[PDB]
Amino acid sequence: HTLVWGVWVNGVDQGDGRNIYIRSPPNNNPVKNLTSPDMTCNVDNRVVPKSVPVNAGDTLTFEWYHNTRDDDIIASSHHGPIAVYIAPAASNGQGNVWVKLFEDAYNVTNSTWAVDRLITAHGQHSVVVPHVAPGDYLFRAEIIALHEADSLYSQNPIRGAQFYISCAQITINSSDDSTPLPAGVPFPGAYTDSTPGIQFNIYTTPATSYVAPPPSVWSGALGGSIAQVGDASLE
Ligand SMILES: *[C@@H]1O[C@H](CO)[C@@H](O)[C@H](O)[C@H]1NC(C)=O
Ligand SMILES: [Cl-]
Ligand SMILES: [Cl-]
Ligand SMILES: [Cl-]
Ligand SMILES: [Cu+2]
């Protein structure tokens, strides 16, 4: 159970984005239904009044929280991977539009899941803004908690992989469009019950065996990291 508070650009806090430049749902409940329109940008997908200006090569940092800003972020039980996707805003995230800019699942050196490192990072994870066409974009940040992912939601709706999905409205101003955005995957649609990484038993299967859901990260990406860029407590 987690939500996005706002974003940072190049290490500078853009301010509370909830229902402003983040298409925020009303609470931190997970999405579980892989076929639901809620997989696109969570349960209250609508245009919000602001879009954060960035340029290609900027660092865009999502900042998550549980109940209050810079708290425990997400329950430690929620081990799983983190991804970020981009699509053009004109799509409203419909169709084959979502391109992967970032993937982190399990780090063998540190023996940590992406979520574990997100807590240590005070909720902060980043991508580098790609050289796509200037214009309006949706950046879709996605945490998958696997603590009940031994079951499939489609079979047992009280269990399943949990998706914490947040869309940010991002305007790319300065870009040479040298890496134009390639075809995307649909959400809902890309993840199915047979997709690697959707059904997994984190209690019996070694984390080193985990494979995150495709698609792979676009070669055009520059992203990106799970790491604290800024100190929310100094505000
Ligand atoms: C899952 O989503 C689909 C598509 O909106 C819907 O038809 C189905 O009823 C949903 N399942 C549950 C259990 O609500
Ligand atoms: Cl609700
Ligand atoms: Cl960190
Ligand atoms: Cl550029
Ligand atoms: Cu939860």
The resolution in angstroms reads: 1.4
Measure the CA–CA gap between 210 and 144, rounded to whole angstroms.
Answer: 13
Which CATH number does the domain housing residue 189 bear? 2.70.50.70
Measure the CA–CA gap between 74 and 23, rounded to whole angstroms.
Answer: 19
Experimentally determined by = X-ray
For residue 135, give the nearest of 91, 172, 98 by alpha carbon.
Answer: 172
Measure the CA–CA gap between 53 and 73, rounded to whole angstroms.
Answer: 26
Is 114 buried (19+), middle (13-18) or exposed (0-12) by CB count in 10 A? buried
| Binding site feature residues for Cu(2+) | 1, 78, 164
**Exposure on the CB side of residue 149, measured as CA atoms within 13 A:** 33
For residue 90, give the nearest of 133, 127, 49, 135 by alpha carbon.
Answer: 135
For residue 231, give the nearest of 8, 82, 16 by alpha carbon.
Answer: 8
Atom of ligand 1 nearest to the CA of 188: 4
Report CA-CA distances (Å) from 123 to 68, 100, 177, 190, 226: 11, 20, 30, 26, 8
Tokens encoding 5: 């508070």
Measure the CA–CA gap between 11 and 148, rounded to whole angstroms.
Answer: 35
Which domain, by its residues, includes 143?
2-235
CB 25 within 8 A of CB 42: yes
Q: Is the peptide bond before 213 cis (omega within 30 degrees of 0)?
A: no
- Calculate how far, in angstroms, residue 118's C-alpha sits from the geometric centre of ligand 5: 14
**For the chain, how many structural domains are there in total?**
1
CB 168 within 8 A of CB 138: yes
Tokens encoding 96: 């084959």
Question: What's phi and psi for 162, nearest 5 deg?
Answer: -110, 130
Question: What's phi and psi for 209, nearest 5 deg?
Answer: -85, -15
Q: Is the CB of 156 under 6 A from ligand 1?
A: no
Q: Is the CB of 157 under 6 A from ligand 1?
A: yes
Measure the CA–CA gap between 107 and 234, rounded to whole angstroms.
Answer: 30
In sequence order, the β-bridge partners of residue 139 are: 86, 168
From 31, 32, 33, 39, mutation site for ligand 1 pocket: most ligand atoms within 8 A of C-beta: 33
